[PDB]
């Protein structure tokens, strides 16, 4: 098996379907990656994650470096061994969660120092340390460490963080290449920045292509801009990236965001789905429902009428309504398994429709029903 | 399949091993029943409960009557259908949890009225209503509704509650027999009371045998008396019950309590295992451990070195330590699956040793290692 081979089997418009072959397995694209936070995909055994159809999961570097610790995971044999998932794992860089979750952050050209949200202990990330942590975890796809740009951003601030991010992309590339075992067995993705600005997006794409990566994320989106703007930025941004490498839209998203992003050339996705009753949200082909709603208390139908998942085979809305209202762990288990299965079924339908040259029709039909 | 047939295949001293055949399946005895509270065995799918070796689970009437409601469960097809467990279910009467968990209880010869601990709504239980709720749930083994005696109890108070409980046992018997579908398909167990007093235990056994039940619980124990006293009371109490019916020790218990209770003629057990870090307790053949302890943070061995469960096949102490410390749902899932599997392996070893005429040796060996 190669370290990394992305092959495009079929195209329709800007959409593509294909495979990434890696040492630990094949990833079918477009792909949805369930998110493992602290070395677990919430409420699911790895076998259950695989049973939903997932080919790859995401691990959060920030959480892992705090608990149990990167060096500790390495001592124990790496993240795959530790958590019992033997297929590919993509790790993020840790940078975003430092900005969103940690306190007392000091930022400079060298990286960021910060206080853990768990115990106030002091930590550091930098391009070099982020790549090192991802090496210690043993992940298969490594994300370059960048500097996030908040939305909204002025052109000056967006340029500055894009420029810094490109300097850090080169540092990430060299750090990754400096470690033989990592360079030979893992892949490295760069992240395009530039906020909503076409010229900065172009400069960033050119800088990243000059350095050269195995894949390219469109960074800096899904941070408050809303779908119309996100799509507008994707419209000009994705074509700037190398066509022959995967395009990853980090942290996206709701089913309709995924479909529209695939229409715009995105191949990979991840997101986590719980505040204010939101743990009760279940995806259906007729749109989301909140299973906590009293209207489900006696509803004997499955979460979704067509879903092939094990939860829909075995349990009713009424039961899952009860479990979630009662705060039972099994409620979280069942809801998560169904929702991730639903996402994987969505991705399968997207892949099949692109392969069959009927993705535009699929997208129209999907929207007409999902938003009816 | 018969409604109920208890057969004793082998004996050693006061210990017995055998089977209860019921319409929904066979229960191997001595049996451990995992506890389903609000229509779920915590953190486990029913298939996983079965995979541990469980033949029957317990459902808590008090919790079920409050949420989702007994009538609602009946409308939805009964508890087995609702939660997806198709084997036997024993339901308790609800009386104990009314006393332990509810507020504003008023007690009389007719039953008990009480305020729900969930929302302060007013409810009632009585022999008749308890039997009716257990009918609406569709359980296979129904417990007579009794009046619990706190420990310690004076002889007068223990006699009064025993006498009331025997009157309520007769009411429970007649209520159960009044409902054709229940009488034909389910079994009814009576509960011996009398606190620590031999004469009251004898009167209670005689009253229950006169009424006639399918099985007999030794009630009123594991309520603070400690193991020596519990065993002392079992020593004289169990032989008073009909030999040819199952003997159930409700809410017991720790592995050593189970072994000693089987030595004294008990055939059935249940208990729930979480306060003050106790969710971290894992059973091993070398005694319990608390997986939260820092000594496990890098321990690559499974929870128990010999356990056949799926958790011990796949994950280390170090990983489960991390999950529990991190408050992850998967930690609760794995710990519960291992602990219930451990209990079922204990019961299998007990059954096999009695069948092979070497239970006394097994008990000695078990204790010498478990308490080393
Ligand atoms: Zn489903
Ligand atoms: Zn185990």
Q: How far is B88 from B134, CA to CA, in rounded Å?
A: 13
Return all residues near A370 (Cβ < 8 A) that are at least 6 apart: A255, A256, A285, A286, A287
Q: How far is B131 from B145, CA to CA, in rounded Å?
A: 8
B361 CB neighbour count, 10 Å cutoff? 12
CA dihedral B349, B43, B286, B238 (to 10 degrees): -50
Q: What stretches of B138-250 show up as alpha helix (H) in DSSP?
A: 155-177, 180-185, 198-211, 227-237
| Angle subtended by helix axes B198-211 and B227-237, to nearest 10 | 50
| Contact status of A168 with chain B (Cβ, < 8 Å) | no
A57 CA → ligand 1 middle, Å: 19
Task: Chain A: give the shortest CA distance to residue B288, in Å.
Answer: 23
Nearest to A112 by CA among A84, A89, A146: A146
Q: Are B209 and B167 in contact (CB under 8 A)?
A: no
Q: Catalytic residues of B, which ones? A: 92, 270
Residue B243 annotated as binding site: no
Q: How far is A195 from A180, CA to CA, in rounded Å?
A: 34
User: CA-based angle B11:B13:B19, to the nearest 5?
Assistant: 25
B69: chain A residues, CB-CB within 8 Å: none
DSSP assignments along B182-214, one per residue = HHHH-EEEEEE--TT-HHHHHHHHHHHHHH--S
Considering every ligand atom shown, identify the ligand nearest to the alpha carbon of residue B283 and give its number.
2
| Phi, psi angle pair for B25, to nearest 5° | 150, 180
B90 CA → ligand 1 middle, Å: 30
Structure letter (DSSP) for residue B34: P
Return all residues near B94 (Cβ < 8 A) that are at least 6 apart: B60, B61, B62, B65, B125, B130, B133, B145
- Burial of A256 per CB tally in 10 Å (0-12, 13-18, 19+): middle
Indicate yes or no: CB of B43 within 8 angstroms of CB of A76.
no
Considering every ligand atom shown, identify the ligand nearest to the alpha carbon of residue B312 and give its number.
2
Residue A256 annotated as binding site: no
Q: How was this structure determined?
A: X-ray
| Contact status of B296 with chain A (Cβ, < 8 Å) | no
B53 CA → ligand 2 middle, Å: 12
Nearest to A39 by CA among A4, A15, A74: A74
Write the CA distances from A45 to A51, A251, A255, B223, integer angstroms: 10, 22, 24, 37
Q: Are B329 and A37 in contact (CB under 8 A)?
A: no
Q: How far is A342 from A263, CA to CA, in rounded Å?
A: 19
Tokens representing A345?
């079924």
Q: Are B62 and B97 in contact (CB under 8 A)?
A: yes
Q: How far is B360 from B343, CA to CA, in rounded Å?
A: 19
Residue A253 annotated as binding site: no
DSSP assignments along B86-102, one per residue = -S-EEE--SHHHHHHH-
Q: What is the CA radius of gyration of chain B?
A: 20
- B-facing residues of A in 325-354 (CB < 8 A) are 325-326, 328-330, 332-333
Q: Which CATH superfamily is domain A1-372 in?
A: Queuine tRNA-ribosyltransferase-like (3.20.20.105)
| Contact status of A274 with chain B (Cβ, < 8 Å) | no
Task: Count CB pairs under 8 A between chains A and B.
Answer: 92
Return all residues near B172 (Cβ < 8 A) that are at least 6 apart: B93, B127, B130, B131, B142, B144, B145, B188, B190
A318: chain B residues, CB-CB within 8 Å: 68, 76, 82
Write the CA distances from B134 to A72, B71, B125, B285, integer angstroms: 51, 10, 11, 37
Nearest to B279 by CA among B221, B237, B326, B233: B326
Residues in chain B that come right before a backbone break, where C and next N are over 2.5 Å apart: 273
B300: nearest CA partner in chain A? A76
Residue B220 annotated as binding site: yes
Q: How far is A307 from A338, CA to CA, in rounded Å?
A: 8
Q: How far is A266 from A258, CA to CA, in rounded Å?
A: 8
Q: How far is B356 from B371, CA to CA, in rounded Å?
A: 24
* Pairing label, strands B268-270, B247-249: parallel
Q: How far is A199 from A205, CA to CA, in rounded Å?
A: 10
User: CA-based angle B286:B309:A72, to the nearest 5?
Assistant: 75
Return all residues near B284 (Cβ < 8 A) that are at least 6 apart: B303, B304, B305, B307, B342
When CB atoms are compared, the residue of A39, A84, A326 closest to B322 is A39
Tokens representing A187?
């892949």
Structure letter (DSSP) for residue A52: T
| Phi, psi angle pair for B124, to nearest 5° | -140, 145
Q: How far is A113 from A124, CA to CA, in rounded Å?
A: 4
Q: How far is A298 from A315, CA to CA, in rounded Å?
A: 12
Tokens representing A214?
């195995």
Write the CA distances from B21 to A51, A54, B74, B186, B268, integer angstroms: 35, 42, 24, 11, 14
Find the length of chain B.
372
CA dihedral B100, B102, B107, B112 (to 10 degrees): -110
Q: What b-and-e string marks burial along A40-60, b requiring 16 or more CB atoms within 10 Å of the CB?
A: bbbbbbbebbbbbbbbbbbbb
- B-facing residues of A in 304-323 (CB < 8 A) are 314-316, 318-319, 322-323
Considering every ligand atom shown, identify the ligand nearest to the alpha carbon of residue B337 and give its number.
2
User: CA-based angle B47:A333:B51, to the nearest 5?
Assistant: 15
Structure letter (DSSP) for residue A292: T
Q: How far is B109 from B13, CA to CA, in rounded Å?
A: 40
| Contact status of B131 with chain A (Cβ, < 8 Å) | no
Residue B95 annotated as binding site: yes
Indicate yes or no: CB of B40 within 8 angstroms of CB of A323.
yes
Q: Are B79 and B39 in contact (CB under 8 A)?
A: yes
Write the CA distances from A173 to A127, A135, B98, integer angstroms: 9, 13, 65
Return all residues near A102 (Cβ < 8 A) that are at least 6 apart: A62, A114, A115, A116, A117, A123
B86 CB neighbour count, 10 Å cutoff? 12
| Contact status of A40 with chain B (Cβ, < 8 Å) | yes
Residue A146 annotated as binding site: yes
Write the CA distances from A194 to A168, A219, B115, B280, integer angstroms: 14, 8, 60, 47
| Contact status of A79 with chain B (Cβ, < 8 Å) | no
Nearest to B202 by CA among B213, B192, B189, B211: B192
| Contact status of A67 with chain B (Cβ, < 8 Å) | yes
Q: Catalytic residues of A, which ones? A: 92, 270
Beta strands in A94-235 (DSSP E): 103-108, 111-115, 122-125, 141-143, 187-192, 215-218
Tokens representing B67?
């949420």
Tokens representing B339?
């602990």
Resolution (A): 1.2
| Angle subtended by helix axes A227-237 and A255-263, to nearest 10 | 20
Whose tokens are 């079929």? That residue is A10
């Amino acid at each position: 098996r190669p370290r990394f081979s992305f092959s495009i089997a079929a195209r329709e418009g800007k959409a593509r379907t294909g495979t990434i072959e890696m040492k630990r397995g094949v990833i079918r694209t477009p792909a949805f990656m369930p998110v493992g936070t602290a070395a677990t995909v919430k409420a699911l055994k790895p076998e259950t994650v695989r049973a939903t159809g997932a080919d790859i999961i995401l691990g959060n570097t920030y959480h892992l470096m705090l608990r149990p610790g990167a060096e500790r995971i390495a001592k124990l044999g790496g993240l795959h061994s530790f958590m019992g998932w033997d297929r590919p794992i993509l790790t993020d860089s840790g940078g975003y969660q430092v900005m969103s979750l940690s306190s007392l952050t000091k930022q400079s050209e060298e990286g960021v120092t910060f206080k853990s949200h768990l115990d106030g202990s002091r930590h550091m990330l930098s391009p070099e340390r982020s790549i090192e942590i991802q090496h210690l975890l043993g992940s298969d796809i490594v994300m370059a460490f960048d500097e996030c740009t908040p939305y909204p951003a002025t052109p000056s601030r967006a340029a500055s963080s894009m420029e810094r991010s490109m300097r850090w992309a080169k540092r990430s590339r060299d750090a990754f290449d400096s470690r033989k075992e990592q360079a030979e067995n893992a892949a490295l993705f760069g992240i395009q920045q530039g906020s909503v600005f076409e010229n900065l997006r172009q400069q960033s794409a050119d800088a990243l292509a000059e350095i050269g990566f195995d894949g390219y994320a469109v960074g800096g989106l899904a941070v408050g801009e809303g779908q119309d703007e996100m799509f507008r930025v994707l419209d000009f941004s994705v074509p700037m990236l190398p066509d022959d490498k995967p395009h990853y839209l980090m942290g996206v998203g709701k089913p309709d965001d995924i479909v529209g992003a695939v229409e715009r050339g995105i191949d990979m996705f991840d997101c986590v789905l719980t505040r204010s009753g939101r743990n009760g949200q279940a995806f259906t082909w007729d749109g989301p429902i909140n299973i906590r709603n009293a209207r489900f208390s006696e509803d004997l139908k499955p979460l979704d009428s067509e879903c092939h998942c094990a939860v829909c085979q075995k349990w009713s809305r009424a039961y899952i309504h009860h479990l979630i209202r009662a705060g039972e762990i099994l409620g979280a288990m069942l809801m998560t398994e169904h929702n991730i299965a639903f996402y994987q079924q969505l991705m399968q339908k997207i892949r099949d429709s692109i392969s069959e040259g009927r993705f535009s029709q699929f997208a129209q039909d999907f929207r007409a029903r999902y938003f009816a």
